[PDB]
Amino acid sequence: AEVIKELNKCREENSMRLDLSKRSIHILPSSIKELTQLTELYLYSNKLQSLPAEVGCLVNLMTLALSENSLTSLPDSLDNLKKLRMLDLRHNKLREIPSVVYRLDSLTTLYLRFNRITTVEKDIKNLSKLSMLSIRENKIKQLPAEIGELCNLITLDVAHNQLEHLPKEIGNCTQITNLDLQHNELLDLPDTIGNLSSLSRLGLRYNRLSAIPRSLAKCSALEELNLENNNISTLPESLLSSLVKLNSLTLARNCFQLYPVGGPSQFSTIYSLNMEHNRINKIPFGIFSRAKVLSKLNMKDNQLTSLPLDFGTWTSMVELNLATNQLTKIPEDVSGLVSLEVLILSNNLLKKLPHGLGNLRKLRELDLEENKLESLPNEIAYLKDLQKLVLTNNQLTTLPRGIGHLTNLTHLGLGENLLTHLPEEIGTLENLEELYLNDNPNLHSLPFELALCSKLSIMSIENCPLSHLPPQIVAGGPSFIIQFLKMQGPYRAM
Ligand SMILES: [Mg+2]
Numbered sequence: 448a449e450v451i452k453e454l455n456k457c458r459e460e461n462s463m464r465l466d467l468s469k470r471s472i473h474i475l476p477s478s479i480k481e482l483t484q485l486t487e488l489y490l491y492s493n494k495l496q497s498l499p500a501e502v503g504c505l506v507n508l509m510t511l512a513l514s515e516n517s518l519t520s521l522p523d524s525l526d527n528l529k530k531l532r533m534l535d536l537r538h539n540k541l542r543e544i545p546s547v548v549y550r551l552d553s554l555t556t557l558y559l560r561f562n563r564i565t566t567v568e569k570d571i572k573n574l575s576k577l578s579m580l581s582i583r584e585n586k587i588k589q590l591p592a593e594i595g596e597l598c599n600l601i602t603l604d605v606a607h608n609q610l611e612h613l614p615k616e617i618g619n620c621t622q623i624t625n626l627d628l629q630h631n632e633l634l635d636l637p638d639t640i641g642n643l644s645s646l647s648r649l650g651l652r653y654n655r656l657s658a659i660p661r662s663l664a665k666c667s668a669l670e671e672l673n674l675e676n677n678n679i680s681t682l683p684e685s686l687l688s689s690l691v692k693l694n695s696l697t698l699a700r701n702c703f704q705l706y707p708v709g710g711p712s713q714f715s716t717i718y719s720l721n722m723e724h725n726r727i728n729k730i731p732f733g734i735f736s737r738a739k740v741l742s743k744l745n746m747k748d749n750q751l752t753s754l755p756l757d758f759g760t761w762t763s764m765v766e767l768n769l770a771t772n773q774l775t776k777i778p779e780d781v782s783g784l785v786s787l788e789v790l791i792l793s794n795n796l797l798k799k800l801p802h803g804l805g806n807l808r809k810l811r812e813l814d815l816e817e818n819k820l821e822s823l824p825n826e827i828a829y830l831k832d833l834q835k836l837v838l839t840n841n842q843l844t845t846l847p848r849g850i851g852h853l854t855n856l857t858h859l860g861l862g863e864n865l866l867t868h869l870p871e872e873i874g875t876l877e878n879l880e881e882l883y884l885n886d887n888p889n890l891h892s893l894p895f896e897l898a899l900c901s902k903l904s905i906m907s908i909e910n911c912p913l914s915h916l917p918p919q920i921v922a923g924g925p926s927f928i929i930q931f932l933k934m935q936g937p938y939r940a941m
Contacts, residue, residue, distance in 0.1 A: 450476065457482050468492050468512070480504040491515050491535065503527045514538050514558070521545040529553055537561050537581075549573055560584050560604070572596035583607050583627070595619035606630055606650055618642035624668075629653055641665035652676055652697075664689035673697040675721075682707035687714070697721040699745070706731050714738035723747040723768070730755050739763055742786070747771050759783030770794050770814070782806035793817055793837070805829040816840055816860070828852040839863055839883065851875040859883070862907060866890050874899035874938075882906040891915045893928065895936030903929065 450470060457465050464487040472493040480501035487510040488502075495516040503524025511528075514537040525531075525547045533556035534548065541562040548557070549570035556579040564585040572593035574580075578601045587608040595616025597603075602625040603617075610631040617626075618639025626643065627650035634655050640646075641662025649666065652675040659674070661683035670692050679701040687693065688710040696717050698707075703725040707713070714720065715737045727749040735741060736757070742765035751772035759780025761767075766789040774795040782803030790807070793816040800815075805826025812835040820841035828849030833856055840863040851872025859876070862885040873879075874896025882900075884890060885907040892915035897903070906925045913921045913928075920931045933939065 451478075454478055454482070457485075463487065463507075465489065475499055475502070477501050483507065486510070486530075488512065498522050498525075500524045506530070509533070511535070521547050523547050526550050532556060534558070544568070544571075552576065555579065555599075557581070567591055567594070569593045575599065578602070578622075580604070590614055590617075592616040598622070601625070603627070611655075613637055613640075615639045621645070624648065626650065636660050636663070638662050644668075659683060659686065661685060667691055669693060671695045671697075674701065676700040678702060680704065682709065684708055684710065687717075688712045691716060693717055695719045695721075698725065700724045703727050704750075705729075706734060712737055714741055717741055719743040719745075721745040722749065725749050727751065729753070732757055735761050735764075742766065744768065747791070754778060762786060765789070767791070777801050777804070779803040785809070788812070788832075790814070800824050800827075802826045808832065811835065813837070823847055823850070825849050831855065834858065836860065844889075846870055848872050854878065857881065857902075862886050868892060869894055869897070871896045873897055876900055878902060880904055884911055885909040887911045893932060895932050895938065898929065898933040898936050898938050 450467060450472060454476060458481055461484055463484050465482065465485055466489040468489045469492045472495060475495060475498060477499055483504055484507060485505050486507050488508055489512045491512045491514040493516050495518060498521055500522045503522055506527050507530060508528050509530055509532045511531060512535045514535050516539050518539040519541060531551055531553055534554060535558040537558050538561045541564055543564055543566060549568060552573050553576060554574055555576050557577055558581050560581050560583040562585050564582060564587060567587060567590055569591045571591060575596055576599055577597050578599050580600060581604040583604045584607040587605060587610060592614045594614055597620055600620045600623050603623055604627045606627040607630045611634050613636060615637040621642060622645065623643050624645050625648040626646060629650035630653040632655055638660045640660055643666055645668060646666040647668040647670060649669060652673050654677050656677040656679055659682060664686050667689060669690050671694060675697050680703050693716050699721045704727060714735060718740050720741060723745045732755045742763055744764060745768040747768045748771040751774060758778060761784055763786055764784055765786050767787060768791040770791045771794040774797060777800060779801040781801055786809060787807050788809050789812045790810060791814045793814050795818055797818040798821055800823060802824050804824060807830060809832055810830050811832050813833060814837040816837050816839040818841050820843055823846060825847045827847060831854055833853050835858040836856060837860040839860045843864040844867055848870050850870060853876060855878055856876050857878050857880045859879060860883040862883040864887050866887045867889050871894045873894060879900045880902050882903060890911040891913060908925055916928060920927050
């Protein structure tokens, strides 16, 4: 109806771009054959199950945009579009690459993401002008050796498929800079992967890799190496020191029991190292002695029972996550870690903290949730940069009076402890915003000085008896308690 007039409009305008997207089109009219001047046809977001043979009359088409339709194929007449440069077939119902697509040898850009494709035929070698090929989110089990004739490829995306291997002939696609293989079933990578010398983005997470080829050392433009969720427990001893632009290394969710063995400069370039969810039973002595730029270490969910003798020499570390290990002590040498801003120690077996904690002048966040802490050291008072202090689920009965010296503290989590009272010095926490006191069964009062925390907007007190406060006030909840402390206490300003 309106597409009749829009096709008609295009005819009289002689416009070389036709946009029929988002028009609920089920059947494309035959008359589209008349608009032979078109170089761009936009049919995306429609209801098309098929393109008519008349589309092959649009022999000047350079762009055919068909995403978000219900196509199963394309007309054999598309053969006649000898100038077609980009075909966009995302989000359709293709069970295979349409036969005609294998003859569109002028194509440089082919988008096939989100279909039902299982096989790439050997005839893929005909599309040797392709620089962008995306077949992400399909059902592909293997690629043909003839992928190696796509020598102009820059981006090859086959993420979210069923690949178990990659043909060694991928090593002939020497222009590739972005190769995404994540979320496949990959058991290995070919030793020829090193032939991809301009490789700068390699997607490998969520596969079944048990090793990395040593030839990957040749891909020295790589700026990230994310091996998350595989089956890796070692690395080629030469690999990391060859990746001289490597910024970040993720070994999370693998089966490392020991740090990978590497050169002296194995960690000399990365800023971030993520080894969370492995089986690592110790951190080697000296492992960060040449890691001047490494500032984030994540060791969460491993098997650590202690820390190396030179722990206190990690002077560049800024964020350290040792959550979900089996640490029983933090050594006094933690005083060495003068750059630390974030220290996460939740879910260990700590009973006390070293006095040396007080040397962490830049510490902003300290998370001690789910330990066995029985006290805090007085030297906590010197953490003047501390903003967030999480002590949830410990065995604390009192806090040091010096807790009130934490000028910058905004978040204080004391839920699930054994507290009998809060110090009056809580009132000098001028910046306190969130105070969690829930599930302290022996906490029977709150100090009037709590009224002095003018920025206090959240406090939890569920399952505290608070029997030294009036029953109806306690039943009113945090809002009523704070108002009561202000009105009955001695601190009203006027
Ligand atoms: Mg899958």
